[PDB]
């Protein structure tokens, strides 16, 4: 490839895997900036 | 490819995998600047 | 390819896999800026 | 027996400027 | 035995600039 | 044997400037 | 007057004399949530 | 007058006198909540 | 007056003299929640 | 001797939900 | 004897909820 | 003699919740 002079090379390999098998109750409250009087 | 000079080469394979398999009950509130009087 | 001079590449491979098999109940409320009295 | 007096005399009086702002239950976003 | 007397006077004079703002139950985005 | 009397005067004069706010119950974002 | 019992009395005498007398300029200017762009 | 019993009695004698004699230049400016861009 | 019993008197004389004789300039400025970009 | 290239792309794809609130220059009171 | 390549690419995906709020010159009383 | 090349790639992904508030210039009373 780069015999010569001045080759640069950045190899970048970025397998990400989120996997969520829920078999069952998943309760989740997100309240930002809310209020309850 | 490139013998003779200033070759530059960025390599990027990227590969995401979200995968939700809810076999069941989800439940979410999300309540932003909400209120409750 | 670029035997001689000033060659650059950069090279994207970018796979997205969103995935949802809900065999079930999903439940979701967004309440941003409402408000309940 | 009960015998009640209440006497109230609110009295304003403005020579000037007044400004007032009341949010009793208001969201401003 | 009850003798209630309630006796109640407002009495309001503006004589500049007046200004109000209620906002019982709003909302302003 | 009860005798009350109560008396209230408010008497407000303003011979300049008066800012108010009152944010009872209210949400500023 | 009341020489026997549960007299009471308030006794109020109020006087104001606002009183301007402009023998020259007097400017004034009162923006309130006005605004200039 | 309250020779007896209970006698109560609040005397207010309030006189309040504003005077403002300007000769010459007076220059306000209120500027409540306003704003210049 | 008040012989026998119970008799009670507040007794309040107020007095005020506001007086502004300007015979110049005055120049004044309130810049309440204003604001200048 | 001036040679240009210039190339952009722009993409955007929303599956869900967006809310934006943009104020330059504004004034809720 | 300039040469000048620019690439850009900008490629945004929303696959669930976003709330954006900007307020480059604004007043909220 | 200049040869320049300058590659950008932005992306974003999101797959949940962004709240995003920015205030430039900005005042809350």
């Given at each position: 490839?780069?015999?010569?002079?001045?080759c640069a090379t950045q190899r970048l390999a970025n397998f990400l895997v989120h996997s969520s098998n829920?078999?069952?109750?998943?309760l989740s409250s997100?309240?930002?900036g809310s209020n309850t009087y």
């Open positions: 490839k780069c015999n010569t002079a001045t829920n078999f069952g109750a998943i997100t309240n930002v």
